[PDB]
Symmetry: C3
Subunit: 244 residues, 3 copies
Amino acid sequence: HMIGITQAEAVLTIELQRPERRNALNSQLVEELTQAIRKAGDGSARAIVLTGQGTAFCAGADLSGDAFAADYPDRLIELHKAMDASPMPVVGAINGPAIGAGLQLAMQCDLRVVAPDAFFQFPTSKYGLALDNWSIRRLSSLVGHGRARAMLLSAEKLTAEIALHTGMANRIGTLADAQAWAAEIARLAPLAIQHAKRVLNDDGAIEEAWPAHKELFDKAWGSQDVIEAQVARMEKRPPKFQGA
Amino acid sequence: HMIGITQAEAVLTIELQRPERRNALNSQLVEELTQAIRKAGDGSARAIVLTGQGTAFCAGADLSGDAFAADYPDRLIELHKAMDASPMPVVGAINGPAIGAGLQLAMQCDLRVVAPDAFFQFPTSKYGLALDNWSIRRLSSLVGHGRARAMLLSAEKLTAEIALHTGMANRIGTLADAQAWAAEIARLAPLAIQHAKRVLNDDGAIEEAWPAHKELFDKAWGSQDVIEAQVARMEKRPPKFQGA
Amino acid sequence: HMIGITQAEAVLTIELQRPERRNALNSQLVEELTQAIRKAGDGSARAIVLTGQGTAFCAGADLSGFAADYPDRLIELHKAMDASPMPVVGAINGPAIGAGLQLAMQCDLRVVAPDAFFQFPTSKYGLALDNWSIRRLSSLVGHGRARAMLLSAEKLTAEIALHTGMANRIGTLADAQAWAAEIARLAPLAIQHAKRVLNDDGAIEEAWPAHKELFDKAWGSQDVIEAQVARMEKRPPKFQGA
Ligand SMILES: CCc1ccc([C@H]2C[C@@H](C)n3ncc(C(=O)NCc4ccc(F)cc4)c3N2)cc1
Ligand SMILES: CCc1ccc([C@H]2C[C@@H](C)n3ncc(C(=O)NCc4ccc(F)cc4)c3N2)cc1
Ligand SMILES: CCc1ccc([C@H]2C[C@@H](C)n3ncc(C(=O)NCc4ccc(F)cc4)c3N2)cc1
């Protein structure tokens, strides 16, 4: 009900379809993606393109109305595990802004073909949030530690142009470009690709949060500032953070 | 006496004031810098800007005249510890050259706004010495392993265009530029900044030296070549090292 | 007889000499190189320069020649370079591909001719790399470009190599030799320390159980046969993932 799926010449394109929320995730969208990823190649697909409808790739998370908000985090980890464990290369066609969970998702693709007007961002410093370790480590490998520091510590946006600079975007292109490239890849040695994907993903980015990490991470999520961020956004005004 | 402290709109600015020696470090300067970091936000400050007076950010160390010079190496570790552990994000305004101890200092800053004429350098292989591991890891993360190899194996300077290029510098600009950036960050959510800083610093660069590293470290520090480099300098001639 | 060695004031230059097979590494070429490096500085030299003769740095690997324990030899060669007290400046004069890219990355610094390029064409031939090749490559071009070079045999040009740090400088053999001569006037102990610490950034990594498995599946696959046959006949492979 919330995604689209088309196959053509060995490439399965999966498409987020919540353009009204700019493809913001919730319980259902994530669950249906998990499912769509696992069942790809069933199907004689050899490659996956992951993209979005309308202007954005994925603007973040929007659990409002989500009858099942509660269990949206585990749903999300499931999505990631599935992508990680997939023998298919996932070419993300980042057709537009990738923000928050949108950037996490983008980063979990195996390759990135990026639209001229797209940008990438972790605005967590704006909402008082805290990221898991994989996000922080994988971001740093993609834009370099220094840019990573500024995206994380000051909510700085990575432009398509600079994504191409750092390697976060592998190419700048359209959906069709991404799909054309995926076709080339679908014609390569799958086992070669499967080994490489796996070694690459095991570079250490998948990291258990240290105790100091889990502590500060708990402290931020449970904080009243997380509430203020949302209220202030509700009331179209700047948040007054207490650091508490 | 050896540093300056001023505050504006939740931004504490700390300025190295030993311009007659190009801000080179010693006991007093290191000691006072430590006190300032720690007592920052005591205070309503939610961000620190760190910079140097005169033409240079920090040109290294000058134990000349230093009475407590024996235990300076520990004092220096404490400064880094204090910075690493501050909940305050630290914006380095690199107003000019950062060499040796100063490059280290610059790297311990959380973000870097670099002046067009500033440059970075570990002239280590010229003076016959060896770095701690952190210095090498954090460098690699910021300029990339390729460029770190050159800076370290051939004492090559990193100009500001290239620092902007790699992420070593987040922006190119003035003390003022950095301060206005520090003002924006000071309005972000403190607890999200603190979590991300901790995890970013725990990327593995704070690494204990392997056995063979400490053997090469001691051998270099205890070499005849360390003296040759100094006398050759004092005689304005090419040094002629021995590997000993 | 398969490499050239010359010395000019503290700089020892080793040249690969199979331009007729674009400097591809075989058992004897691998052997003599290992030796040359071990016996370097014996010898007043303080820096080494490594380059290939003709148009290529190293086109890859070549088991033409009684060479089954070739994989061990090729590992000793890297063990030798990693262990060498002297810094090795790679004058990458032409394309470095496969084992050739591996050899280039084991150099300590790289001066790259503007016409060279780099490539693991490993996904075209259904093969798998050792972990170090993948870690060092990521360190040198960034994780993002490494995924591309690894998952679709993307070539890295001298220009982007310069951009990412794979290439320190774009220049000639002469340029590399001049740079080595400077490096040979710096403090050896300081250089030895840095080299060791840098090489121990974690890239020398043992394959996990899962990696070793996929590695074996790939190497022992039929798709390897199909890749060689398809290549030989200038035609697209029809892989099966088996
Ligand atoms: C194994 C492949 C893989 C699995 C999971 C992930 C990421 C995806 C991301 C949405 N995400 N969000 C939270 C988590 C996650 O791991 N949460 C548990 C946790 C506990 C204490 C902490 F301090 C931090 C995190 C996670 N894991 C990344 C990669
Ligand atoms: C925990 C945050 C942190 C603290 C300290 C450091 C750095 C700062 C730098 C000035 N610095 N200088 C010497 C040391 C240092 O760690 N010296 C001990 C040592 C022992 C054997 C060796 F082979 C090498 C080093 C150090 N550690 C980096 C990060
Ligand atoms: C210690 C310095 C060093 C030594 C060796 C290597 C590289 C060089 C490359 C030619 N090369 N080729 C095969 C191997 C290699 O490591 N083969 C053993 C192996 C076992 C199971 C696996 F899944 C993967 C690999 C290797 N290691 C890199 C660095």
